[PDB]
Symmetry: D4
Subunit: 148 residues, 8 copies
């Protein structure tokens, strides 16, 4: 069968592309989905679609109307979820998608550097797998389909 | 990936054909489903399948037997829902479909003229996206498959 | 045992007090919950908590945050739902709540005048019981506990 | 009776304000939440199952117990109040609010307007986003108000 | 710890009194609920509330609106179900309720005379316990609370 | 837009082939599933697989182990259900399958002669559509994909 | 608030009594439920209630009808579960109950000696808490109500 | 119409390839999934992905992070489950996956020697089908698709 996998995380690095390229090398039957990766497009889609809001709290809420729509639709298609944390930014959006995955019973892989273990401890304790590198998560993905 | 989208709303006007045409113009992988769009067919289907009924309430209730079957079966295929409100007709069928999507965790876009913001304020507050025109909806549909 | 019943509908008339009085007159083990029945309080609760807003759509949305929080919390306590429709106002909020109850499997009584049956036909077809008056709904409530 | 989970950082005593103000109004709400003693909460893992080979494992075994307690009390809660501050990563707070949204429990978020952007997706999914406890209390009183 | 138990079956005889009597002799913490047991009232309750119907099919459907509302509400309170089949009548309603219990994860005891084993074979195979008499179902209920 | 449909009802006669042929002629995107239609094989599959049993109850229960396995696996594939009742045989299995469909939210069509309206009143009341004939059911299936 | 806790594990010893007294000593708001603790009674209840059976397998199956009924009813009351494994007996029933609690979202504490960690690795990995002793379990229970 | 079937059981023997070969010879539309069948790979996958662990308990728990991830992901894909028990090894993981199938509504065939009926009585009572051999289980699989 084929798998759909949601990639939750901060869009500022190209961590997702790397996942997508190493997976294709191994020819795994996995299709990845996730949020809009352009940070500028993502912050402004609210005004782009529903007109320039007067204040900044309304500009973000309008953009979140659209981005939460995209996330809900793709998450509903996702068989399981991979969420990556990094040392920069609040990343409450990432914790939200990860916790959503767990709450809905979608298996979750968390990718995180060990130096962030303490603030992630409740979330990683709930995850199926916590690793520190994309390379480790790839090995977990390969093991899904291996025969020996 | 393919998506199935239920178009909820009044069948008196031909608003769904704008949505279908435009979406196909962008080649989004979206199949639309919805109610029987022929108002005279839809009102009379109960008496067409079963016979003429003793009175008007029972003519509507039999047509509803058939129409609520169609909408349940298609809505069960639907990944998300778009519901449009116009300024004519009671449209409690439209509110019932929108609120159903919400209740079942299907993402919901509402289309409604700003002039109807107050009678819809509870329902738009619960939907994922509330816009004013079909073109604004199309933009949100495209943002689902956009890379930038 | 005890039952919690959500009375959904127009807060412009006083049908709810009629249901509560006749239920207490029969001494049924039923408690009634429902929305804020003061329309001006309800329309304005958003500004009363979160301060006055830049426009009327935003003022209505903020009031809907609070009123949908009260509705959600109280619906989650309701064993079943009575929804009354009247001749005046869109009542898209009434259709919403009744549809919510159907979608969640909460038994539902609709009270509606025969003259609105056609616009309510799909929704009434889905409810457990549709009746024209409050006295009728009270007889179904009483039948719940009757022994002969 | 309503059981309400208070989610958020345990370093400060914001929960103490809500409980006191809610009791003044005589609202029929009973409050539940995590262990509020931070040192207890960080060491409960080692307290029950013994010292761990490293810090990660120390934090993991503590999460067994703390995630047990939260699951159990969350399962009793009718709805949730999550508070965010300017201090700490607060990923546990975001986890609990998201969990409430996923399970259809209504959610109030208390958060200062300065944190509006990092919280944008989360507050968008909450029922109510307010800035102060006093506003949350008004939403709560409104649950039982008649006029 | 108390339990609510729905007693589904033909109302045409008095098996439910035997169950309630023997349970109270044992002082078990169980409250029973069930359909209206006066057959003529149950048949006529549709017209009692919504007036004489145009034909017998409509008279039975209106009665079914009310009896199924009563069944849904009481069933929603019940922790588990006891369903009794006898030799008289079609009893398609009894199989409906028993099957409803199974589908909803409600433990089910079926009481049926061995004479009826073959037409009941699929249903009794899905029930937790299938016995021949009320006394056997009573011993099941006692075993729930026993200590040795 | 393919639909799997479970055909519940007595296996002694050949009503399913008429539905299957008439559907294929109209070219509807529907595949049908159902129980083993050979009555002798269906009564004996318990003893064929699990071996000769000591008595006729055990023979019927082992047959039901297998038949309820097949019904559950195919029911789980099914988008909706057609259940047909006739005048011969108990048909408690038909009531079981139809009630299961309704409990799990599968839309349901009941086909039953008007002379059986009374014993089936609760069950037809819960079904989406209750018709008298196979050709009526087909008209409802056609309506699913009709555009005008 | 009250908590109901299912105690799963072998019925050959009296480890449950240790849990019940130490929890009583501490005055925790916890009521414990569990299977019939008398093995001879537990093994023969099938024959006690239904006939003596043709063979050992049917004796065990009939006993399990009643025991799985008690388990399902009591489990349905339980907020969470404690399962204890020991060095004797197959204890597949124990693994059953623990897996069921995991699968239904019921928090689960597992007590197992370190010598059984390898054969229990999958199950303990899924549990909320794995400890070696009853005393460790009681510390987890007390942490539920502790204020410092 | 195709089915995915999880093969739960001990990964020391090759019982599974017997099921897969005979199924293929019969050309049934069934694709089988299951855990990693190589025992040494399975025990060490935790250290292989995540590094050598401080002790055997942690080596087993890291392996179980990975193995339970595989099991959750494939089980979410499975329509039904076949579990085989033999006389060797603790097989609590087999009981775990079998109970999981029951708890999630996935149909279940258990294969177990009659000599193990007593320790398996509760689990076997809840399975759809319990047989002694792979050949009997194949007769059940084939009955699923049979026309006579």
């Amino acid at each position: 069968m084929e798998f759909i996998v949601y990639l939750a995380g901060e869009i500022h690095s190209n961590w997702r592309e790397e996942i997508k390229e190493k997976t294709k090398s191994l020819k795994l039957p996995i299709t990845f989905v996730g949020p809009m990766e352009n940070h500028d497009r993502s912050d402004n889609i609210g005004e782009e679609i529903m007109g320039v809001q007067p204040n900044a709290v309304l500009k973000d809420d309008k953009a979140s109307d659209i981005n939460n729509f995209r996330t809900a639709v793709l998450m509903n298609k996702a068989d399981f979820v991979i969420a990556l944390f990094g040392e920069k930014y609040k990343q409450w959006n990432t914790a939200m998608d990860a916790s959503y995955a767990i709450a809905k019973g979608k298996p979750l892989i968390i990718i995180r550097p060990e130096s962030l273990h303490h603030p992630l401890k409740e979330l990683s304790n709930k995850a199926n797998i916590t690793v520190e590198t994309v390379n480790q998560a790839i090995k977990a993905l390969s093991y899904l389909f291996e025969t020996e």
